Amino acid sequence: QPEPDMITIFIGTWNMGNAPPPKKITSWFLSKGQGKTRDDSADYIPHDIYVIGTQEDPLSEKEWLEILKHSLQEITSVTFKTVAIHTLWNIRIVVLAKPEHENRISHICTDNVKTGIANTLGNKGAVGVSFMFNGTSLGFVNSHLTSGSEKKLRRNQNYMNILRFLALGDKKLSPFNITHRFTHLFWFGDLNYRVDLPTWEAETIIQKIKQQQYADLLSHDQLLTERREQKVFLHFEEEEITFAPTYRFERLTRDKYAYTKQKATGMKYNLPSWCDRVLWKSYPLVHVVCQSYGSTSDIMTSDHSPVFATFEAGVTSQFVSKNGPGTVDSQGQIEFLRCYATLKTKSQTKFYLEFHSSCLESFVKSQEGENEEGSEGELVVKFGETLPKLKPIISDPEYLLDQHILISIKSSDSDESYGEGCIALRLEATETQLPIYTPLTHHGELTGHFQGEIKLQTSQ
């Protein structure tokens, strides 16, 4: 029975509005409704992994797991295994997988982050799950961010707190936050970003939605504009939105948007918005293809519609050789030539690098670089040909070309990371000097760049 090199992943996000679901929710898992929908010919094909994020979820874990498992068994005739379930308040994440994957899944982690302080601490935040699927690390975040059209900067702050403090994946990757710990990271939820148009334009917006003309609405979507201005979700992807706004509906129909201010809303308007989203970030040159992104039309118990997204995701096998794991493969090496970091910092400490990868027995510390002043004010840290030769555990090119090197640049004075990035070993050539590049981030914000050349020696 061969190990897969691709799997499909279902991501669902649904703000349930504190109401129990209707009896049938299969359209959600089938990716049927509005937007980029799944072909009918695939309906009986199970996804490998189903990740379900809810917000305002009124159910117990047991109650929701029974509904989800029943739903999937009715669609696929497969009894899914529960990988993980984690709840913070009324924010929940469930991960289900086909039974054949039970012995491919390991290192399961869960965590939550509570956002805000005092007044603003007690219902918003995030839950997450991570695990290994054979040689591939997968992370999943379900966040419920701050509500309200005039709180976009609070949402951006909520995002940065969640990616700083959510403790998932390999704790040995100590310089790295969740935006660097996984081959594939999916981040979804009621992100609560709104269409920023005047209140007076509510009926005009509704008109546009009825005509399926989303362009003049999407150009005002706060998440798209904040992402274009590099305020949030830097280096994440989102499929094009081709479904109507998923909030705020009158319950028990989808015929009406309920936008007007009420005591129940704190006298706030809720103009139709794409609150409910799925984004992802995968390591460079790993296969990831969105195959659906849409909303259901037939699940109407909440003031939000459920959102679905599905992905093809490249995965690798748990590689064994005669040598590694448990020794090096002297036939393998990674060399960095002519490397330098450009940093936005005003500080003047010496810096060193750390190289982290599951292709190394443990992380590698460089010598300090040589600081120069850049033309336009910047700090340039030169490593030249000084970087330590990296010794992978396995030299087979079928393994090594699929790996990645995480890089942290750290202050000699504080040992704190000033920037983190990732280099793919999926090179055009081996035994050949080739350009490499990553942006560097810290707390998910841009802090610099790392560029140079690589020379990769494999057993071939």
Name the site residues for ligand U0V (rule: CB under 6 A). Answer: 26, 44, 74-75, 77
Work out the number of other CB atoms within 10 angstroms of the CB of residue 397. Answer: 17
- Specify the residue, 201 or 298, whose C-beta has the smaller distance to ligand U0V: 298
In our burial notation (b when 16+ CB lie closer than 10 A, e otherwise), range 326-347 reads: eebbebbbbebbebbbbbbbee
The nearest distance, CB 75 to ligand U0V, in angstroms, is 5
- Specify the residue, 298 or 368, whose C-beta has the smaller distance to ligand U0V: 298
- Specify the residue, 41 or 77, whose C-beta has the smaller distance to ligand U0V: 77
- Specify the residue, 24 or 210, whose C-beta has the smaller distance to ligand U0V: 24
Closest CA to 449 of 351, 371, 356, 340: 340
**Cβ–Cβ under 8 Å, residues 459 and 432:** no
The nearest distance, CB 73 to ligand U0V, in angstroms, is 9
The nearest distance, CB 74 to ligand U0V, in angstroms, is 5
Q: Is the dihedral of CA 256, 257, 262, 266 positive or negative?
A: positive
- Specify the residue, 23 or 228, whose C-beta has the smaller distance to ligand U0V: 23
- Specify the residue, 26 or 349, whose C-beta has the smaller distance to ligand U0V: 26
Q: From CA 295, how far away is CA 10, in angstroms rounded?
A: 13
- Specify the residue, 77 or 253, whose C-beta has the smaller distance to ligand U0V: 77
- Extract the tokens encoding 457: 């020696």
DSSP 32-53: -SEEE---GGGTTSPPSEEEEE
- Extract the tokens encoding 230: 């590099």
- Tell me which amino acid residue 308 is: F
Q: Is the dihedral of CA 118, 119, 121, 123 positive or negative?
A: positive
Backbone angle region of 243, left / alpha / beta, with phi > 0 → left and psi within -120 to 50 → alpha = beta
Q: Rounded to 5 degrees, what are φ and ψ at 345? A: -60, 150
Three-state SS at 279 = strand
- Specify the residue, 44 or 437, whose C-beta has the smaller distance to ligand U0V: 44
Q: From CA 22, how far away is CA 25, in angstroms rounded?
A: 7
Hunting for tokens 């959510």 — which residue is that? 166
**Cβ–Cβ under 8 Å, residues 152 and 110:** no
- Specify the residue, 69 or 124, whose C-beta has the smaller distance to ligand U0V: 69
The nearest distance, CB 77 to ligand U0V, in angstroms, is 4
Closest CA to 254 of 316, 210, 207: 210
Q: Rounded to 5 degrees, what are φ and ψ at 409? A: -105, 125
Reduce the secondary structure of 135-192 to three states and give it as a string. Answer: CEEEEEEEEECCCCCCCHHHHHHHHHHHHHHCCCCCCCCCCCCHHHHCCEEEEEEECC
Q: From CA 88, how far away is CA 112, in angstroms rounded?
A: 7
- Specify the residue, 75 or 209, whose C-beta has the smaller distance to ligand U0V: 75
